[PDB]
Amino acid sequence: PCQNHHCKHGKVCELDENNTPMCVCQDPTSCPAPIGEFEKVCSNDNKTFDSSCHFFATKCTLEGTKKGHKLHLDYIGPCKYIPPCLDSELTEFPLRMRDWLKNVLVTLYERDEDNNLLTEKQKLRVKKIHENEKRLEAGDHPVELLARDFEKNYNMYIFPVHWQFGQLDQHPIDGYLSHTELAPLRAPLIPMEHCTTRFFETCDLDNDKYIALDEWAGCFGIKQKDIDKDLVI
């Protein structure tokens, strides 16, 4: 009778006295063992957990706690040595990753089949981007080029910038990216990913430790006037 009951990350459904479904913290050892280093995860305390399940099981007991509020999945994989974000790389990061977005969204559209990846309206949006003679092709471009393109193709970035935020705001969906939600942006694929944290600390204007839509958008150069919640969902 808990089959339909989907408890959030870190918890599981156990029936209480009245045989009613209840969400309690999952036993970290009830999580499946990791297949390889790739299933492991690293917290922001530099402690490699066996898997995000294990991590979220552990972290579950800290709900409400000041310690818990701070406990976060830094990145997927085993805790690795992370190179300090050079002052240089940091200023060049926004441009580097903003382009990365447009290209990811493009390749998603190209890989999409019967909307398995992009919804209807989303595909339409990425379509206008995709088939535009002006669209700068993907490749390792000098920050200068990436910059001139941003001005010369600003409208081409408004959706990609908005999309990524939606893709991340899911733990839970509330319009804010926690340190954990930004974890995907710390994977090796991201350009100068070691700068992700440093950078996003730059975006966290009111320093609440959460990147909100306006901070995120504004951090990527998207005019506050061009921010649109409809583009996120």
Place this chain on the structure above:
Amino acid sequence: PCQNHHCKHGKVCELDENNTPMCVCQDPTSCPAPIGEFEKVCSNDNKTFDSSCHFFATKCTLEGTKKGHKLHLDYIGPCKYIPPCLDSELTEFPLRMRDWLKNVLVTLYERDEDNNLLTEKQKLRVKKIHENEKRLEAGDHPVELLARDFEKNYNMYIFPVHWQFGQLDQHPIDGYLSHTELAPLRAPLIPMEHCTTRFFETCDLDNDKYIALDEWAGCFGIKQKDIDKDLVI
């Protein structure tokens, strides 16, 4: 700032957002590792836990749960093979263990020095028992003898019967012995200990899975009129 804050078994003090002490479930791996098999414990699922700390840490996440309400420390030590409680042994159990109490309490008084074991009034009580010509000496006695003594020395059992209950009602102190609190009575020392559960299921009159003082006392033959809470604390 949690130093003074003593959370109950299974939980620990972690500060919440307002730097206020909060009681959250303890991380079972934060428990000290067991010294030897003797530090291990066995649950009623026949699963040997690393230590009561570990067990109570695990069980902590099940508060409220029907599964949790049933999760109990069966006995201290590793899960061993347990011999069935023969009908015979069951009827003879009350007499066997009631005597065991009087003798434990006596030897405690003899081993006491400056009240390290028995409080002041408690010693006085066990003293009147100890130095009484009529007191049946310790030894393996036929159930018949143990019986005749109970009638002939009833007053000599009222305190021992009450004391033991107090010694057990500690998780928490509420006047009820849970399956876990009765664990000490499942150790090898107790006479026909394998009959402990079976027996106490007999005492649990209103079948709530808890042995209350009246059930406990009455189960050992102590008159309902001779039950005294003052003798417990």
